Amino acid sequence: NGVHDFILVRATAIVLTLYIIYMVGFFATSGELTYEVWIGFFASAFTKVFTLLALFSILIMAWIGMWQVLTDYVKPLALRLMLQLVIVVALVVYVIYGFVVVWGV
Amino acid sequence: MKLPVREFDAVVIGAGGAGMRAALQISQSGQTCALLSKVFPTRSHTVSAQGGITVALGNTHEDNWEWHMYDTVKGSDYIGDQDAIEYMCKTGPEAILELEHMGLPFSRLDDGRIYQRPFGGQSKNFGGEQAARTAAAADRTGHALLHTLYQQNLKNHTTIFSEWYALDLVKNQDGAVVGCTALCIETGEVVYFKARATVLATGGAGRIYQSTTNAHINTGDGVGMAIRAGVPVQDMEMWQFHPTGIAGAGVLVTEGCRGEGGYLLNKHGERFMERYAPNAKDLAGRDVVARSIMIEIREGRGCDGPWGPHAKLKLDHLGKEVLESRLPGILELSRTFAHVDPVKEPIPVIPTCHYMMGGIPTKVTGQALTVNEKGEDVVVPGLFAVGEIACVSVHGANRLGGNSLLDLVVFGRAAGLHLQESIAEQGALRDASESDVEASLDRLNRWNNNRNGEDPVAIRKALQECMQHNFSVFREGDAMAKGLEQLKVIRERLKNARLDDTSSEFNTQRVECLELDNLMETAYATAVSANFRTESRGAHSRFDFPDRDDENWLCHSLYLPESESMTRRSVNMEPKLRPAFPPKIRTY
Amino acid sequence: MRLEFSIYRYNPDVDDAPRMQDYTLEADEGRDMMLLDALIQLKEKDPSLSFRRSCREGVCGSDGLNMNGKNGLACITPISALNQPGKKIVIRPLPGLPVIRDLVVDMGQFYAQYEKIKPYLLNNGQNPPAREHLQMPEQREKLDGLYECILCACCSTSCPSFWWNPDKFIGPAGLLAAYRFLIDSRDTETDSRLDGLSDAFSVFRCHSIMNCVSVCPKGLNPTRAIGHIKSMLLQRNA
Amino acid sequence: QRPVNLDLQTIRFPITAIASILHRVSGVITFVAVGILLWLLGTSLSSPEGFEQASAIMGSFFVKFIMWGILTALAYHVVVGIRHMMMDFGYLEETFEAGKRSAKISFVITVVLSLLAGVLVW
Numbered sequence A: 001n002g003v004h005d006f007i008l009v010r011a012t013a014i015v016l017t018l019y020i021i022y023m024v025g026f027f028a029t030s031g032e033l034t035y036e037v038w039i040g041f042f043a044s045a046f047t048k049v050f051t052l053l054a055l056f057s058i059l060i061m062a063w064i065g066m067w068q069v070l071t072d073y074v075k076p077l078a079l080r081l082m083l084q085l086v087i088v089v090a091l092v093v094y095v096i097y098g099f100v101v102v103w104g105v
Numbered sequence B: 001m002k003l004p005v006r007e008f009d010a011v012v013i014g015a016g017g018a019g020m021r022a023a024l025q026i027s028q029s030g031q032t033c034a035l036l037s038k039v040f041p042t043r044s045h046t047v048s049a050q051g052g053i054t055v056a057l058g059n060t061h062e063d064n065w066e067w068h069m070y071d072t073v074k075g076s077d078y079i080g081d082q083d084a085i086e087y088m089c090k091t092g093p094e095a096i097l098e099l100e101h102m103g104l105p106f107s108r109l110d111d112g113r114i115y116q117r118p119f120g121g122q123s124k125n126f127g128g129e130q131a132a133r134t135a136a137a138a139d140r141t142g143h144a145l146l147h148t149l150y151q152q153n154l155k156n157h158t159t160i161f162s163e164w165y166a167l168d169l170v171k172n173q174d175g176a177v178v179g180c181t182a183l184c185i186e187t188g189e190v191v192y193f194k195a196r197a198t199v200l201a202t203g204g205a206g207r208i209y210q211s212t213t214n215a216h217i218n219t220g221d222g223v224g225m226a227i228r229a230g231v232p233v234q235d236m237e238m239w240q241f242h243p244t245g246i247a248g249a250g251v252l253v254t255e256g257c258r259g260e261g262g263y264l265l266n267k268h269g270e271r272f273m274e275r276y277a278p279n280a281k282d283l284a285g286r287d288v289v290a291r292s293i294m295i296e297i298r299e300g301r302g303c304d305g306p307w308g309p310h311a312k313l314k315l316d317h318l319g320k321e322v323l324e325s326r327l328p329g330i331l332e333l334s335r336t337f338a339h340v341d342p343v344k345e346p347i348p349v350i351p352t353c354h355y356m357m358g359g360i361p362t363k364v365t366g367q368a369l370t371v372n373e374k375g376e377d378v379v380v381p382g383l384f385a386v387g388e389i390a391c392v393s394v395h396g397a398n399r400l401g402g403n404s405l406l407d408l409v410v411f412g413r414a415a416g417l418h419l420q421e422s423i424a425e426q427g428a429l430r431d432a433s434e435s436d437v438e439a440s441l442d443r444l445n446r447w448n449n450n451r452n453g454e455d456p457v458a459i460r461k462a463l464q465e466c467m468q469h470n471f472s473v474f475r476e477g478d479a480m481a482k483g484l485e486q487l488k489v490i491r492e493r494l495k496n497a498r499l500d501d502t503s504s505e506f507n508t509q510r511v512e513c514l515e516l517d518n519l520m521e522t523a524y525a526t527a528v529s530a531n532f533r534t535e536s537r538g539a540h541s542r543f544d545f546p547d548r549d550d551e552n553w554l555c556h557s558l559y560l561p562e563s564e565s566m567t568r569r570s571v572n573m574e575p576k577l578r579p580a581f582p583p584k585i586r587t588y
Numbered sequence C: 001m002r003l004e005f006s007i008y009r010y011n012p013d014v015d016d017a018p019r020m021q022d023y024t025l026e027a028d029e030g031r032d033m034m035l036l037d038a039l040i041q042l043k044e045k046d047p048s049l050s051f052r053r054s055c056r057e058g059v060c061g062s063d064g065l066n067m068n069g070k071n072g073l074a075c076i077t078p079i080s081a082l083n084q085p086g087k088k089i090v091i092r093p094l095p096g097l098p099v100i101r102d103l104v105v106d107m108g109q110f111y112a113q114y115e116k117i118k119p120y121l122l123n124n125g126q127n128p129p130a131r132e133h134l135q136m137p138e139q140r141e142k143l144d145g146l147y148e149c150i151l152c153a154c155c156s157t158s159c160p161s162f163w164w165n166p167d168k169f170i171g172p173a174g175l176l177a178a179y180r181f182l183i184d185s186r187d188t189e190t191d192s193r194l195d196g197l198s199d200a201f202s203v204f205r206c207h208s209i210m211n212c213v214s215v216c217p218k219g220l221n222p223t224r225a226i227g228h229i230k231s232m233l234l235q236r237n238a
Numbered sequence D: 001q002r003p004v005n006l007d008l009q010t011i012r013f014p015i016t017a018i019a020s021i022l023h024r025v026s027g028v029i030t031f032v033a034v035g036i037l038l039w040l041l042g043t044s045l046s047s048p049e050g051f052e053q054a055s056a057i058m059g060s061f062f063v064k065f066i067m068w069g070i071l072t073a074l075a076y077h078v079v080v081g082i083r084h085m086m087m088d089f090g091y092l093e094e095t096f097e098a099g100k101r102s103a104k105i106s107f108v109i110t111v112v113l114s115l116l117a118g119v120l121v122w
């Protein structure tokens, strides 16, 4: 329902804001980005979890957000459902790809 | 029938306060009802009502409906029907409390009760201390009332035909009204609304004047339709000129301004109402206050400026808080149309055509009345009237502020409560023939077929100037006689007026042309009546007959359409619950 | 001085499509008239020009128009606030709604949403008052800024969300009315009203665009009202 | 069928409306941007060779511009997104004036973040 979306969007918004502060913090304080310091940062359990958590948050945020855009500009039912399929699949792919990328670091 | 026929038990022409209250009651009584209106219901002139509703609730102070009846009877200068006035004041409280239960957003006292403010012609103990019995929602009462009623009609699922224009009443061979023809403004389709009861609730006709507080849609279509149908109108010379219309604009500023403590001043800064009305002062009868202002101006004591001749309405001493709380509406109006901030500076005001006290004679039941060859009253089978189109009469020669909205609700409801008994009383009405309905379209057909005629705009402006010059606050024999002759000439030009827009999809030109006919009929009836009454009573003031004549003119005036002549009807002076108030000298 | 206008014209029985027509009106040099004054005079020269109007005092809400790109009432919009050296005063119908004729739009969908939120007092009848419902000044003040709506549709016809889904999104005006009854101490069906506003469209299509607030001729604030409704929806369904 | 006036070029839009439509646009762009950022990240972590390859790609001027755009769109969506949530929680007033003021402040804050994003990319 409308209330459920409103909450999920803000919940994930808070999480992703913290994740961005975390990711920006690193980038803005590391100097020379050698391959070593890079892989060390993403080898951390804290970075792995926070990143995957962010990907789940993006899934929810982006899905609700894109759904609102489509229901505004895309009237034809068939066309909209197909676009929602592509979008949802892509979002799920993001999360899955994130698992494969981090689990092997 | 080569014209669509839409049949209902009742057809209510007009969606103002009176019309919507009636439709609401008729529907709840178990009868089918069609609610017509030439504008969206909430666009009716009722929406502009400010002051509030005068009713003896007894919230601000201990009150009595008999006190209210006294104020009304005296206010009407003793030609107001006392049996009708009794019914209104007595029934008032219940009828108004009923609106509050509908959700009407009344202003509130500290204890939670409906707020009541002082108003003109309000006293305790039969002409004693100043009273305060005008229930209000700030100064947007009309707005609050109208919307609440529309909301109630929505909840009731009332059948509303919005933006349909009533053309003329339909009569059967027995002389009974069996409905009316209407023009769908959007599509242009013309239809015959067949009914056992046709209720006229079309409002006033301030637009017959050059300057009025009325909306553009107040063209007295009800008066025109009545006259062309042979139905007489009453007290048409009794036009109320509200004391405080914005000078140079005509837009009204509520009498609540003076009810809250505001007063009038002249160029010398004198509160002159203390001289003209030692007792009630700025809260005296409207007919008296209006003349007092015009006398000040006429004798060079009026103020001048961009707005033109006027008097000053002081309000600043009330404080920003009270002004913004109780009178926000007039703050916006004054700043917009006068470029004056009432919080700092007085408002430029001048008496402006406001309310039509005359109209179609009716019983308390709403049933329309006519007179036979003997002068006796006989009911017009099938015809009804409520609101400012009606002449009950509860206002006589001068209506009290706040009594109109009360009138709308009480008698709109009355017509509904008694509709079943009225229909059974009149018996079955014979069907209208195809020529009967066709006759109602003659006026429309003329416009549609006239291309090379006269410009209606010039005709309208000539009409309005004639009424403004010769039938305003002050009148005289000579001027009215010439005004009447001019109207005859103007009426002849109108018979050959042209319609420059022939389209059918939302053609407003056709509507306004059709309205012009009604302005003419209302203006003419007013003129003939004004010349007729050779006395000065209430809002009707003549220099050649400056005194009130209770021996010859303690009665109503009646305009007979078929003979275009005048006659008289008795004023009712037999209340049921108390003795009648005897005619005495009327001073404030 | 001379005034120049560019006015939206359309007649289904004549025009294949809408069009803009140039108008000229000689005006009094030292006198400032309202747009409605001009329109009325233009009709005197061109009787075919159709538009709505009535109270001419900004109360009835008949003459809502898109003037120089912005919605408002012709009866209270001074010519001086529209007139710019070198440019025509552009007058068009309220955006989003079907155009019946010239400057007249079909307000059907606008009224439909108004009815959808049940704009009438809903009192269950229990604990009836002796006379009128007792409402303290404090409780009554909650209605201020809400009941003044004149249903002119200036706000809704300026809201993109209303443009895209006029049949699902209640719109600024309608929601202002919904809250009008939601916080009326005399209304006893608050919970029922909220349960009918929990879907994804009714209320939550409002994204604080704030076109509604800027155009409201009565100076009302639909955005704040909608904000309050959202809070009530959360307090109940979160 | 009836015509409607919805010619966007003939309509005035306040700063609040502009800020709103941009937030929606920035949201859509960020949706696509995530995939691009993930594709880049995956390459830079697969091997020592993949990282150098990722560095080389970041060397390209055309990629520098695009990357700056992505970070700018993200920065805007985040800032204006917080502006939204501040109104939802009552930290910001919902008046037209407050709406304008907060919108302008959002633009300034975004421009600053856009420049810092430029520095981080040179």
Ligand SMILES: *Cc1cc2c(cc1C)nc1c(=O)[nH]c(=O)nc-1n2C[C@H](O)[C@H](O)[C@H](O)COP(=O)(O)OP(=O)(O)OC[C@H]1O[C@@H](n2cnc3c(N)ncnc32)[C@H](O)[C@@H]1O
Residues within 6 Å of the ligand: B013, B014, B015, B016, B017, B018, B019, B036, B037, B038, B039, B041, B043, B044, B045, B046, B047, B048, B049, B050, B051, B052, B053, B054, B141, B142, B164, B165, B166, B167, B201, B202, B203, B204, B213, B214, B215, B217, B221, B222, B252, B354, B355, B386, B387, B388, B389, B401, B402, B403, B404, B405, B406, B408
């Ligand atoms: C002008 C005015 C009057 C007024 C007032 C302020 C102003 C500016 N303030 C008042 C106040 O504070 N207290 C009070 O008691 N009265 C006040 N008044 C006077 C009062 O408001 C009016 O007399 C009253 O509102 C009249 O109501 P009524 O229902 O009788 O008339 P209406 O509201 O104007 O509605 C008329 C309806 O009829 C429809 N109509 C007209 N012609 C046709 C045709 N031909 N076909 C179909 N329908 C028609 C109109 O559409 C309208 O809805």
Ligand code: HEM
Residues within 6 Å of the ligand: A009, A010, A013, A014, A016, A017, A020, A058, A061, A062, A064, A065, A066, A068, A069, C207, D023, D024, D025, D027, D028, D030, D031, D032, D034, D077, D078, D079, D080, D081, D082, D084, D085
């Ligand atoms: C990280 C990837 C993100 C993507 C792809 C994304 C995408 C979107 C989209 C498409 C919308 C819909 C906007 C609309 O309907 O007009 C939206 C809404 C929103 N976003 Fe995000 N977003 C992301 C992250 C964030 C972050 C970090 C924040 C921080 C505050 C945020 C805050 C918001 C808020 C508050 C809304 C509500 C918009 C409204 O109600 O008008 N988002 N997002």
Ligand SMILES: CC1=C(C(=O)Nc2ccccc2)SCCO1
Residues within 6 Å of the ligand: A072, C160, C161, C164, C207, D008, D013, D017, D020, D021, D022, D024
């Ligand atoms: C409907 C909507 C937006 C929109 O459609 N804005 C807009 C479109 C066209 C022209 C101006 C503004 S932007 C914020 C999310 O909701």
Ligand SMILES: O=C([O-])[C@H](O)C=C([O-])O
Residues within 6 Å of the ligand: B049, B050, B051, B052, B242, B253, B254, B255, B256, B355, B400, B401, B402, B403, B404, B405
């Ligand atoms: O002055 C008013 O508020 C208004 O004029 C009231 C009546 O009743 O007519």
Ligand code: SF4
Residues within 6 Å of the ligand: C148, C149, C150, C151, C152, C153, C154, C155, C156, C172, C173, C176, C215, C216, C217, C218, C219, C220, C222
């Ligand atoms: S909220 Fe304002 S703009 Fe919207 S319909 Fe009501 S008065 Fe008109």
Ligand code: F3S
Residues within 6 Å of the ligand: C158, C159, C160, C161, C162, C171, C172, C205, C206, C207, C208, C209, C210, C211, C212, C213, C222, C223, C226
């Ligand atoms: S313009 Fe529309 S988006 Fe909300 S703030 Fe007003 S209803």
Ligand code: FES
Residues within 6 Å of the ligand: C053, C054, C055, C056, C057, C058, C059, C060, C061, C062, C063, C064, C073, C074, C075, C076
């Ligand atoms: S004419 Fe009634 S609001 Fe403009």
Ligand code: NA
Residues within 6 Å of the ligand: B356, B357, B358, B359, B387, B388, B389, B390, B391, B392
């Ligand atoms: Na009358």
